[PDB]
Write a protein that binds this ligand. Structure first.
Ligand code: HDD
Ligand code: HDD
Ligand code: HDD
Ligand SMILES: *[C@@H]1O[C@H](CO)[C@@H](O)[C@H](O)[C@H]1NC(C)=O
Ligand SMILES: *[C@@H]1O[C@H](CO)[C@@H](O)[C@H](O)[C@H]1NC(C)=O
Ligand SMILES: *[C@@H]1O[C@H](CO)[C@@H](O)[C@H](O)[C@H]1NC(C)=O
Ligand SMILES: *[C@@H]1O[C@H](CO)[C@@H](O)[C@H](O)[C@H]1NC(C)=O
Ligand SMILES: *[C@@H]1O[C@H](CO)[C@@H](O)[C@H](O)[C@H]1NC(C)=O
Ligand SMILES: *[C@@H]1O[C@H](CO)[C@@H](O)[C@H](O)[C@H]1NC(C)=O
Ligand SMILES: [Ca+2]
Ligand SMILES: [Ca+2]
Ligand SMILES: [Ca+2]
Ligand SMILES: [Ca+2]
Ligand SMILES: [Ca+2]
Lengths: 688, 688, 230
């Protein structure tokens, strides 16, 4: 906020002006008489409406729906023996960042909690150029060659004739593609697991996906995978809960990130690399160049390089978040590409697509895209040229500008250089590498590694999605492919969708596992920004007062208590009308609120002597409680509030149901335990 | 320069970087082996070539060919009793300016010296907003309603089928339009006179064309015409000279301006207004709203308000000159529009057309277009948004931003306001005003007011142009219209083009004149930047030495002496091969150079022993001399240099031919007298 | 469909081609060897990805979320005593139409069932030119002068800092504008009633909102409101 502040427009206590600084008024069109026609000479009208008429720019072709934040990177060491990259050159060295998180398929107003792969794009504004790692929350991708991207995306996006369905793979074309292109199976399993529906952007990890090269000044290389290890913990929804959130708060995840940062609860990730040798490319039984494969951490551990903290919200979403233009081609000395055909083609796309978004070639001149390092080159002109180059002789080699700008390379001026030992060999060809052909072993590895509940969630997701697939041909092709991963998986999905159970095809079956790969099964590391909804009543003021008492006990772990009541009164945060279970990570019925939770509240006729409230829909309080329970959330009750649990047929003997006499330390302890468990998986049926 | 310098990129003694600050080299593509194919991952190649591929923007729809300079305006007074305009509020108040001069019809890269109307666009960067007067070097325009602009311009521009001819009205469609739309006749006469082919942009006046309103803080108005009175004086070419210049130096006028500013010979114009009352709109015998009419200075004198000086060339032509986007809608408090239908429609076009040029709505954010005043409004977003608005509540009326930005109007915040007594009355209609119907009386006024030679130049121009009109219908229609101006004019043109001499139609004939309206007839006020070509010979070093001697005698009046010889040697500026009469305002043959001017030099056989030079084309020196004479320029000879005059059959008794013994003060005095006269009109035949 | 069919591209049982008619394959990038780098000379790759990279156009500034259908209008009469409009000149005269329905505030991909005013835009492809009535499902609008449109829309649309909330008036700026500009109250009541959340586009009426003029060949006029009665 040193650098960007030069572009700020402050509009506090000032007179309105045109875009060229003439003071104006803008509330009435210029007319010929009181009731007359509007005049063409009204330049105030036309300038104002013209800016409005042209406000929009094309949404991103993929990842249109996203949110961003500023942050800072701190290096944990001097990594110069591993890479020449300046931002990693010293312990404690700090580098500004901008990060954008996103879904993939949906357009820009689609719901945050759609099931999808998620983007995780991080820019380092380094002292030797902008460096972008444009990653995902899943370490593998659907396809093995960038040329297949429009096929994949056309298949997952809405139908060409009617543009249905929005932000969903639950339609024929998507599953047609997945089953025709089995490379997709690994990513598919991740997306059908908890990783497709995370609780927030703070509760995911990030991955560069591709193998990259790190390069030292003397040209030595290592092969790496980039990791962003989240310091909050993994937390994910179940499907029915994600759907409900989409209806109640389309902005759920962007709101969570914004509010956490405003509250000073800065989320953090550690940057790590799996460090490998050039000679390791084929050593592990798969190709390091294949973006559908993970390197299990049992084989190569993650070496931690430093830490990113997100600590500042944008001032203007459009200027900063909408306009940020990431490119994997934003590379710096000390990093190089590999021959991963997915990565290779990506490099073309990100330079080209900004011409669509920006409408011209000078997109790197936007404040959010500018480097924090000097720019000196012979590039010229183009629409939207915001600089005035003083050198009128824009060519090399020259004598007219005394040989400047000067060439920079491996040995002089700290130039970028391609890793010097990289070689090409063989015939020019359009082929699929024979090393890429195992599409099934790693999906089985992932499947083996999940807790039973998460295996079920995958099954339930695929049952849901493929029941929406009309084509019998597609449904059958899907089951055949799933069967090559696991006969159990295929059989459990087939039974819901009218497909005969397949016989085992054991070519790729195995029992290998890798640890903690699922979204479920580990406790949260931090509870920052989680919310407890305290269901209270204005008719019993002592119920409302329990909010403040519970809050004081939970403040130190960064948990907010939200007081819900029938109407806005002192110390009430929101009304039952405006509330839903999906807003809260835990729900607590306050002592004295139990009268709102009658078991007949859903269907009772609102007669005068029923004394039903008009302040919220029939059964709203009980609905919040029951939804919270069914979704697997921590539920609690204080004092007589436990009567509400009985009305809802919720036994206090169940895990994740807590009762307390009052809102003391003993109760807060239970709630903290519940919140760290996050979801109580014993409430979900599993196939026998 | 304090403002624009923040956008400067200095590339002296620096390493080459990408657009995002990464040091690079850019001289070899990345290849697979020494003789291999280029790799897609070469981001250095692609960023460099993408910038190049997108360098161009659409040329302006009209006035594509032009040049600009920075300057400063000084007010001669406190004009607050005449106008609320801030830049005219104090004696000695200074305001930065940018000015662009242009032709109209030709594309980018067309010749400076095409016959055309010329643009004269001046921006004042005032403390209360940018104010543009977008004018021409002729006070009247061809048409009376903006809606006819595409018709006029399609007719004047090249044919639709083959795009011939460039930058010329000498084709059927132009003269078809002129003869079908007699409103065009007044501007046509100005353009066919010397005003169509000026010597330089320093030697023209400027005009706002339209009647505007000036308005005081209390709402009182005057009607005005804006004038830019040039302080150098009017100077113009003859047609055959303008053509030869187009062949030898397409950049003649832009070069003249650039070099004059570099030499510190800053051209100046005084801003003036003819001040009239609202009640004067019809009382002069024509309508002040009619842009085809002048107000003769005999009826209303010009009141001088201040002075513009142009004193700094751009640093980068594209960034500054190509991207400057003028608008008559860039108006400030203290000025208002009139109901001139040409002005009225212009207001729409200049806001719309910048969307084409810039490719998006944020063109006022380009450095050259930004105001030197604060911007505060609720306009938002759009492609190429270079600001970050801090106010997230971009609407009025608001409480969320405490009611800011606040409305500015006549009485508060110094807002723009429409002159409060302007009224509308009558039926909505698409009609030509009955007050606009006299198309011929003022053309006759202009014709009457010219010296005989300039009458002849109009005749000669029309003879040239209409001899290139194939259609007999068009030729006949032209003569009919000209005849309504003057039977003399019509008959003189008709005789060249095979049209029968028309009978007089005396409806609009009159004998009134207005003073000094032509481009010819007055002496120059300043000789700054005029050029004397001294034709010398390396074989007679004393001839070259006369250059320095003549230069010393002429340096005090800002005239340059250019020494021309066979080859570059000490104190030689140009070679005969690279020289032409059109480069010089006067040509002098040096003592000792006379041997180069033999009468047989055009046709002698260049055989071995003939002695003829290969250093320049046959007859070049004599050609320069004879061209200079025929074009009407000052011609001189020193010492035995006078033998060259004898060879060219040029008698020294002729006006504007001067001889002397040596380059002393007496000869220099004669040259200054010749340069002040500029063109010797007695060398041109006139109809009897 | 006779008119639009000339622009149809039929891709049943055909070989794949480039945009300039050259038969191609598009499933593997051209590489230097089996595991090598992708070549710049792969024009098949670049044309395919360039088309993809540039698929999107800006969404409409308002009414971004909408759907359309083709149809046909039939005149019930010869209305020449009321209007010179050609498409209303004979009983039984038929004119092709296209209609788009929409919400107002939400972006592309926002929910159909957001509470909002709804667009009802109908084009008549008449024999004397295209005629559009660009209407809404509510007969009155929030503001009385077009110059206030960006103010209304900036207030209703998501906050400038964080772009929250999507497709909703349930935030401070919207209600700030509504309460500062009481002209908005009539439309507000319609939108807060069932008209803000219809069951479908088939179960709403349409309105031109503005008073228009109808004019006969001899220049006689009536003032009208246009209605589409479902
Ligand atoms: C050849 C096409 C192609 C392919 C194969 C990929 N992408 Fe990409 N992606 C684009 C073409 C593209 C794009 C069309 O160029 C986008 C849309 C907007 C933009 O700036 O780039 C983009 C955007 C985009 C964004 C959003 C950046 C932002 O927030 O603005 C992310 C996070 C990713 N991609 C991530 C990935 C990952 C992790 C990939 C595989 C490992 C991947 N993409 C493959
Ligand atoms: C309605 C169409 C129209 C009409 C009737 C006029 N103009 Fe204009 N003119 C334009 C439409 C336009 C334009 C298409 O909007 C241009 C082209 C580029 C631009 O910025 O504006 C322009 C450019 C343009 C320029 C170039 C500004 C520059 O250097 O960038 C000048 C000097 C003028 N015009 C002068 C005039 C004069 C003195 C007019 C009559 C008194 C006139 N124009 C009538
Ligand atoms: C001056 C600004 C302005 C104002 C005051 C209005 N509109 Fe409008 N409207 C636009 C500016 C606009 C626009 C920005 O020009 C749009 C966006 C996309 C487009 O084609 O036009 C548009 C789109 C648009 C659409 C979508 C057409 C489609 O489906 O593509 C409809 C149905 C309406 N408007 C309806 C109305 C109604 C019934 C209005 C009041 C009676 C109204 N608008 C006032
Ligand atoms: C890098 O390795 C070298 C040689 O082994 C040694 O000087 C040093 O321990 C290392 N330096 C850093 C940056 O840790
Ligand atoms: C880098 O540039 C320098 C200076 O021109 C040159 O000497 C050197 O050989 C270049 N190449 C490499 C690979 O270092
Ligand atoms: C303006 O007019 C008044 C009254 O006629 C006069 O006294 C005053 O000097 C004028 N102001 C200027 C700046 O000329
Ligand atoms: C200008 O605005 C002020 C303050 O809002 C208002 O009182 C006044 O009527 C306006 N003045 C004119 C001349 O319209
Ligand atoms: C000159 O103009 C005046 C005023 O319009 C007019 O009365 C007079 O007749 C004209 N005289 C000549 C010489 O035609
Ligand atoms: C129009 O009006 C006339 C006279 O009132 C009437 O006779 C005629 O039938 C009308 N035309 C139609 C088509 O209704
Ligand atoms: Ca391949
Ligand atoms: Ca329990
Ligand atoms: Ca008119
Ligand atoms: Ca010649
Ligand atoms: Ca003489």
């Amino acid at each position: 906020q040193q650098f960007l502040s030069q572009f700020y427009l402050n509009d506090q206590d000032v007179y309105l002006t045109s875009n060229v600084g003439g003071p104006i008024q803008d509330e009435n069109s210029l007319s010929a008489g009181q009731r007359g026609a509007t005049l063409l000479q009204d330049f105030i009208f036309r300038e104002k409406i013209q800016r409005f008429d042209h406000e929009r720019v094309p949404e991103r072709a993929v990842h249109a729906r996203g949110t961003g934040a500023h942050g800072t990177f701190t290096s944990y060491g001097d990594w110069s023996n591993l890479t020449a990259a300046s931002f990693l050159s010293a312990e404690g060295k700090e580098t500004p960042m901008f990060t954008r998180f996103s879904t993939v398929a949906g357009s820009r107003g689609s719901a945050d909690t759609a099931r999808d792969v998620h983007g995780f794009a991080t820019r380092f504004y380094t002292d030797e150029g902008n460096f972008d790692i444009v990653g995902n929350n899943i370490p593998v991708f659907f396809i093995q060659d960038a040329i297949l991207f429009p096929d994949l995306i056309h298949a997952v996006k809405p139908r060409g004739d009617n543009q249905i369905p929005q932000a969903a793979t639950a339609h024929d074309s998507a599953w047609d593609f997945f089953s025709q292109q089995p490379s997709v199976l690994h990513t598919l399993l991740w997306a059908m697991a908890g990783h497709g529906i995370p609780r927030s952007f703070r509760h995911v990890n990030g991955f560069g996906v591709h193998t990259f090269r790190l390069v030292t000044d003397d040209g030595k290389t290592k092969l790496v995978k980039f990791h962003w290890k989240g310091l909050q913990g993994k937390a994910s929804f179940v499907w029915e809960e994600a759907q409900q959130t989409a209806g109640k708060n389309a902005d759920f995840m962007r709101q969570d990130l914004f509010q956490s940062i405003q509250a000073g609860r800065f989320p953090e990730w550690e940057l790590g690399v799996q460090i490998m040798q050039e000679q390791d490319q084929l050593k592990f039984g798969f190709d390091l160049l294949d973006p559908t494969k993970i390197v299990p951490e049992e084989l190569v551990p993650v070496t931690i390089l430093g830490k990113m903290q997100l600590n500042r919200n944008p001032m203007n979403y459009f200027a900063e978040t909408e306009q940020v233009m990431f490119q994997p081609g934003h590379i710096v000395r000390g990093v190089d590409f590999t021959e991963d055909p997915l990565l290779q083609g990506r490099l073309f796309s990100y330079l080209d697509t900004q011409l669509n978004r920006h409408g011209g070639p000078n997109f790197e001149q936007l404040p959010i895209n500018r480097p924090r390092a000097p720019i000196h080159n012979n590039n010229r002109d183009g629409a939207g040229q915001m600089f005035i180059p003083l050198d009128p002789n824009a060519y090399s080699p020259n004598t007219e500008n005394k040989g400047s700008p000067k060439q920079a390379n491996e040995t002089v001026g700290k130039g970028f250089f391609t890793a010097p030992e990289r070689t090409a060999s063989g015939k020019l060809q359009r082929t699929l590498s024979t090393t890429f052909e195992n599409n099934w072993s790693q999906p089985r590895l992932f499947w083996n590694s999940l807790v039973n509940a998460q295996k079920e969630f995958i099954v339930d997701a695929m049952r849901f999605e493929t029941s929406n697939v009309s084509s019998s041909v597609v449904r059958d092709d899907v089951i055949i492919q799933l069967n090559r991963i696991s006969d159990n998986l295929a059989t459990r999905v087939a039974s819901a969708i009218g497909v005969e159970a397949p016989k085992p095809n054991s070519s790729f079956y195995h029992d290998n596992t890798t640890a903690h790969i699922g979204a479920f099964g580990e406790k949260l590391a931090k509870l920052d920004g989680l919310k407890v909804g305290l269901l209270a009543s204005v008719n019993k003021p002592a119920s409302i007062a329990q909010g403040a008492k519970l809050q004081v006990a939970l403040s130190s772990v960064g948990v907010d208590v939200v007081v819900v009541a029938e109407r806005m009164a002192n110390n009430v945060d929101e009304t039952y009308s405006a509330s839903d279970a999906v807003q809260f990570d835990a729900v607590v019925v306050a002592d004295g609120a139990e009268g709102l939770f009658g078991a007949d509240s859903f269907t009772v006729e609102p007669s005068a002597g029923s004394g039903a409230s008009t302040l919220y829909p029939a059964g709203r309080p009980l609905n919040i409680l029951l939804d919270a329970f069914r979704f697997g959330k921590t539920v609690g009750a204080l004092g007589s509030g436990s009567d509400a649990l009985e009305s809802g047929q919720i036994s206090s003997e169940r895990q994740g149901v807590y009762t307390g006499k009052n809102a003391g330390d003993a109760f807060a302890k239970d709630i903290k335990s519940g919140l760290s468990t996050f979801k109580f998986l014993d409430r979900f049926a599993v196939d026998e």
